[PDB]
Design a binder for this molecule. Structure first.
Ligand SMILES: [Yb+3]
Length: 397
């Protein structure tokens, strides 16, 4: 990872800042796998601005850039979060980027992810995804409504419940605009696919044919929804035109075809099929043509997620007898196992393709994990009151 210094932000008010901003920026950069922040334990100093920054102390220590900041109170009850990125190495002392934000204590972490998104894109030329969110299902220890569809920042904080249920909920999927979630609920007794508007809580009932309805995915252009129905005896792909409520069948047969994911063209799909025996990933244009297998490595591959630029995909894969999240380059065919935990499942990619969120078993339970797509960084998300599954990473917001 690219060395970088991130200094704890300056605090000027009721002793003890409400949020460690520097800590959030360091975690974000580290989380992407693109940077290696100096441990707070080795910082050669704790400067407060684009002046107290002495390059040789850093510019020397293999760090050609430091982040400094200041968190100051407002009479309005809000706060002012400001950061400055100093260019040691090359032109020591220079300020490469800086900014300041007025936010409520509720949005302190958001201001922290805004700084990191700015610093990340200025230094890497890749748009940051630190202000994104994730959706997931938590089975708590409450008895009436054990299942809860929740949403939080990609890093697990600031979570909120979208919906509580007495019956199982699964496979949330974000609309491309980030305003709605599609998911499967068994509340009515049988499987049902619904779309819920986050702001409103309004729920649109989409499909509840006989049998199982599940694994939804919105096309990137917003005009269609793909999913799998097993009303034919086995799962097959259907796509619904959201502007006309129209539904078309895409695959047919005795084989199971499910877990669709869209290529950037909103016309092609990668999906899981047990056609060849053990699950493998195939691709098909929904307008026509025969599906083509695309995973030839590994004994088994499934539940793919194609990146936003279509350069690669991540999936659940079996290599050397073990199942982990792996990624496959869609141009070269190169494959690389990214995770190393137990029973890795349902991987979802950040909108900039730099991180993947997935679940793994934990004792009798389940938790979420993040692994950078270059494979460098691995971390468990914050624990919550319950076992967690089916994470879905939101598009840019
Ligand atoms: Yb998936």
């Amino acid at each position: 990872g690219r060395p970088i210094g991130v200094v704890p932000f300056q605090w000027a008010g009721p002793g003890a800042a409400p949020e460690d901003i520097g800590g959030i920026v360091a975690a974000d950069l580290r989380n992407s796998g693109k940077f290696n922040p100096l441990d707070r334990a080795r910082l050669p100093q704790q400067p407060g601005s684009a002046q107290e920054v002495q390059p040789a102390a850093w510019s020397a220590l293999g760090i050609d850039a430091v982040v400094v900041g200041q968190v100051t109170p407002n009479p309005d009850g809000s706060y002012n979060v400001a950061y400055q990125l100093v260019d040691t190495g090359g032109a020591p002392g220079t300020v490469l980027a800086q900014n300041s934000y007025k936010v409520n204590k509720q949005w302190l972490r958001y201001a922290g992810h805004t700084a990191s998104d700015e610093v990340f894109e200025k230094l890497t030329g890749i748009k940051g995804a630190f202000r994104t969110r994730i959706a997931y299902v938590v089975q708590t220890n409450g008895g009436q409504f054990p299942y809860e569809l929740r949403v939080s920042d990609y890093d697990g904080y600031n979570q909120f419940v979208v919906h509580r249920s007495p019956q199982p909920l699964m496979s949330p999927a974000w609309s491309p605009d980030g305003s709605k979630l599609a998911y499967v609920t068994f509340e009515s007794g049988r499987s049902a696919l619904v779309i819920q508007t986050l702001a409103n809580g309004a729920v649109r009932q989409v499909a509840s044919f006989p049998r199982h309805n599940g694994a939804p995915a919105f096309s990137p252009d917003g005009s269609k929804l793909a999913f799998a129905l097993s009303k034919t005896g086995s799962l097959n792909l259907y796509v619904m035109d959201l502007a006309s409520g129209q539904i078309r069948q895409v695959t047919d047969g005795r084989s199971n075809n499910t877990e669709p994911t869209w290529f950037p063209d909103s016309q092609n799909l990668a999906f899981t099929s047990d056609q060849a025996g053990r699950p493998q990933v195939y691709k098909v244009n929904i307008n026509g043509g025969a599906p083509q297998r695309i995973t030839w490595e590994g004994s088994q591959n499934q539940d793919a997620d194609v990146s936003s630029d279509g350069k690669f995909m991540v999936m659940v894969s079996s290599n050397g007898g073990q199942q982990h999240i792996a990624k496959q380059d869609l141009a070269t065919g190169g494959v690389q196992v990214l995770s190393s935990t137990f029973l890795d499942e349902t991987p979802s990619l950040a909108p900039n393709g730099t991180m993947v969120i997935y679940s793994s078993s934990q004792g009798m339970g389940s938790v979420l994990n993040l692994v950078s797509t270059d494979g460098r960084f691995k971390a468990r998300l914050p624990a919550t009151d319950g076992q967690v599954k089916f994470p879905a990473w939101s598009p840019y917001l």
